[PDB]
């Protein structure tokens, strides 16, 4: 009876195994754009993905992760609210059963069809495993998806999903360029928070881009053909794998722009 997104194992249950679920710095949150203070001391965000090397894509039973070879200094996030340099290890998405929901963060209560999370670890902690033991171990770039025009650079991901339909399936996934998932502007909001899945550790500097990317209805429909279950188990579509907004608890949200 492991955690999931269903009625009996979903977000409202997670606190029993992971009491930090009711902690002081839980994610996601609703971003009240009217209360985010423009911090003119925030430096330009630097997203440097030109040497990124993807390895594999995996259905982990909750989402699918595109994992990177992070053994060298190759795909780094720095600047903005961050001290030091953070290295890309994986990205994944959260999405809905319908276009009207799916994002974890919300913007003045608005939900997007999906949300991309590019997960980076603070290089001063040596690797991901030790970084998640630190309150500033991770920096996650969050990007909203809306349904409209297709995102051409997403199509390579969409096309491999049929090979990882069920929990535990993985495939080789090399030479994927995550620059093709980024919107024009790097305007963002930033706040301190957590992983949005168990173990819900409070190690994340969140950097949520204001500008969504557009994906096609057909692209997100293919996400919704994935399965939460393993092969040879009853089929449960992987949809609505998002945690809802959590209490802000007097954290503050900063803005990179006016």
Give me the least distance between CB of 28 and Zn ion, in Å please.
9
Give me the least distance between CB of 258 and Zn ion, in Å please.
28
Q: Which is nearer to Zn ion, 198 or 257 (CB)?
A: 198
Question: E strands, 148-186, where?
Answer: 170-172
Give the separation between CA 35 and CA 69, rounded to whole angstroms: 38
CA 105, 223, 241, 111: dihedral to nearest 10 degrees? 30
Task: Give me the helices (H) in the chain, please.
Answer: 14-17, 128-131, 155-160, 217-223
Bridge-based pairing state of the strands 213-215 and 170-172: unpaired
Give the separation between CA 201 and CA 214, rounded to whole angstroms: 30
Report whether 92 belongs to an annotated binding site. yes
- Count other Cβ atoms within 10 Å, centred on residue 56: 16
- Count other Cβ atoms within 10 Å, centred on residue 35: 10
Residue with tokens 């009853």: 234
Give me the least distance between CB of 40 and Zn ion, in Å please.
29
Q: Are 227 and 236 in contact (CB under 8 A)?
A: yes
Catalytic residue annotation: 62
Q: Which is nearer to Zn ion, 101 or 196 (CB)?
A: 196
Give the separation between CA 45 and CA 78, rounded to whole angstroms: 6
- Count other Cβ atoms within 10 Å, centred on residue 1: 7
Q: Which is nearer to Zn ion, 117 or 222 (CB)?
A: 117
Report whether 197 belongs to an annotated binding site. yes
Q: Is 183 helix (H, G, I), strand (E, B) or coil?
A: coil
Give me the least distance between CB of 38 and Zn ion, in Å please.
26
Q: Is 178 helix (H, G, I), strand (E, B) or coil?
A: helix
Give me the least distance between CB of 94 and Zn ion, in Å please.
6
Residue with tokens 């995550």: 178
Q: Which tokens sit at 195?
A: 């992983």
Report whether 117 belongs to an annotated binding site. yes
Give the footprint of Zn ion on this chain (CB under 5 A): 117, 196
Q: Residues forming the annotated binding site for Zn(2+)?
A: 92, 94, 117
User: Residue positions in the annotated binding site for substrate?
Assistant: 196-197
Annotated binding site: 92, 94, 117, 196-197
């Amino acid at each position: 009876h492991h955690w999931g997104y269903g009625k009996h194992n979903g977000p409202e249950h997670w606190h029993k195994d992971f009491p930090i679920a009711k902690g002081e710095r839980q994610s996601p949150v609703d971003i009240d754009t009217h209360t985010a203070k423009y911090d003119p001391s925030l430096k330009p965000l630097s997203v440097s993905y030109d040497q990124a090397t993807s390895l594999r894509i995996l259905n982990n039973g909750h989402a699918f992760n595109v994992e990177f070879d992070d053994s060298q200094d190759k795909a780094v996030l720095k600047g903005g609210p961050l001290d030091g340099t953070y290295r890309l290890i994986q990205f994944h998405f959260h999405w809905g059963s319908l276009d009207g929901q799916g994002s974890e963060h919300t913007v003045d209560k608005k939900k997007y069809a999906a949300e991309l999370h590019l997960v980076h670890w603070n290089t001063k902690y040596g690797d991901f495993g030790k970084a998640v033991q630190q309150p500033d171990g991770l920096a996650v770039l969050g990007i909203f998806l809306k349904v409209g025009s297709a995102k051409p650079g997403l199509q390579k991901v969409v096309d491999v999903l049929d090979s990882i339909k069920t929990k535990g399936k993985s495939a080789d996934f090399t030479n994927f360029d995550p620059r093709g998932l980024l919107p024009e502007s790097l305007d963002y909001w930033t706040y301190p928070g957590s992983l949005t899945t168990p173990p819900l550790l409070e190690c994340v500097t969140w950097i949520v881009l204001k500008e969504p990317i557009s994906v096609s209805s057909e692209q997100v429909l293919k996400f919704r053909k994935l399965n939460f279950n393993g092969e040879g188990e009853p089929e449960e579509l992987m949809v609505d794998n998002w945690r809802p907004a959590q209490p802000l608890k007097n954290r503050q949200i900063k803005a990179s722009f006016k």
